[PDB]
């Protein structure tokens, strides 16, 4: 079985191999969106609480919030559902989905950290990843940089740095196109 662990605080992701069925007997009744103590995983994981986000079956099928069953069921999907993207306005396709009860059948599980412990994870909490793009709507800059109603918000626009590939010409800057 495979586990895909993600850390939203620092924004990092890793996957770990676990082969001991005895270690994972502690779930197998937990639902989607619940709390659990990750301490019995091991000593370096003491003082951790995990949130169950979802997984993939052995065939590749995902699970869907709101269907209470350990098996998989066919349903009549519509617009707005989680595991279907229609190709034309108004389509409704019948598909098969996995229930919201964890079991020994799943092929890959996935979890997120809610509260850390004292030990550190050798590949997860030691590196931190930044965000990708700053704000661009007018109200966002004022609240973000705490300016008042009349503080010339336009000037404070976070900009990126880009280098032209032409004869190593001196780079220039790129900006977010303030709206409203």
């Amino acid at each position: 079985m495979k586990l895909n662990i993600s850390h939203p605080a620092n924004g990092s992701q890793k996957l770990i191999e676990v082969e001991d069925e005895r270690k994972l007997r502690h779930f197998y009744d937990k639902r989607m969106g619940a709390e659990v103590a990750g301490d019995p995983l091991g000593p370096e994981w003491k003082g951790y609480i995990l949130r169950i986000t979802g997984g993939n079956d052995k065939q590749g099928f995902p699970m869907k919030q709101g269907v209470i069953a350990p098996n998989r069921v066919r349903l009549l999907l519509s617009e707005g559902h989680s595991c279907y993207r229609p190709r034309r306005d108004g389509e409704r396709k019948r598909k098969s989905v996995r229930g919201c009860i964890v079991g020994p059948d799943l092929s890959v599980l996935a979890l997120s950290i809610v509260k850390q412990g004292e030990q550190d994870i050798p590949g997860l909490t030691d590196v931190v990843h930044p965000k990708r793009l700053g704000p661009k709507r007018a109200t966002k800059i004022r609240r973000f940089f705490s300016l008042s109603k009349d503080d010339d918000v336009r000037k404070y626009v976070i900009r990126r740095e880009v280098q032209p590939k032409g004869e190593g010409k001196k780079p220039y800057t790129k900006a977010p196109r303030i709206q409203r």
Binding site: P8, A9, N10, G11, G33, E35, V114, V128, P130, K131, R132, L133, G134, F145, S146, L147, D151, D152, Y156, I158, R159, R160
Partner: protein
């Protein structure tokens, strides 16, 4: 080993007891004992049978409730570093209070006023030459 729950009456079932009945349309039923099985085959309704687990739950006899919604609703976290600049650089963009920011504003508006006056002066010069033309 494993255990099952009676379909008709909800009683618990250990290995070896009871039987398993498969209906014509590929639906599997389990009965803990003869009493459940016999009643089911007569098209009786479980809702109206006084000793069933479903009947008790439907009439709400002897059970209470629980909730923890507002506990998991307090999960809020902190901000993270942008790629625009160094995280410490990001903060100091609004670390300072309103003195130095205000001082720049007077210079900026004076620059704006100077350009507008130059435009008006240039326009008057442009108007004069146009008439002279």
């Amino acid at each position: 080993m494993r255990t099952y729950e009676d379909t008709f009456s909800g009683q618990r079932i250990y290995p070896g007891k009871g039987k398993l009945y498969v209906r014509g349309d590929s639906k599997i039923f389990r009965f803990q004992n003869g009493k459940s099985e016999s009643l089911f085959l007569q098209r009786k309704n479980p809702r109206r049978i006084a000793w069933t687990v479903l009947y008790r739950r439907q009439h709400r006899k002897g059970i209470s409730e629980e909730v923890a919604k507002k506990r998991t609703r307090r999960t809020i976290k902190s901000q993270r570093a942008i790629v625009g600049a160094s995280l410490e650089v990001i903060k100091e963009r609004r670390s300072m209070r309103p003195e130095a920011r205000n001082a720049a504003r007077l210079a900026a508006i004076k620059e704006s006023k100077e350009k507008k006056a130059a435009a008006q002066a240039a326009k008057k010069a442009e108007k004069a030459k146009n008439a002279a033309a």
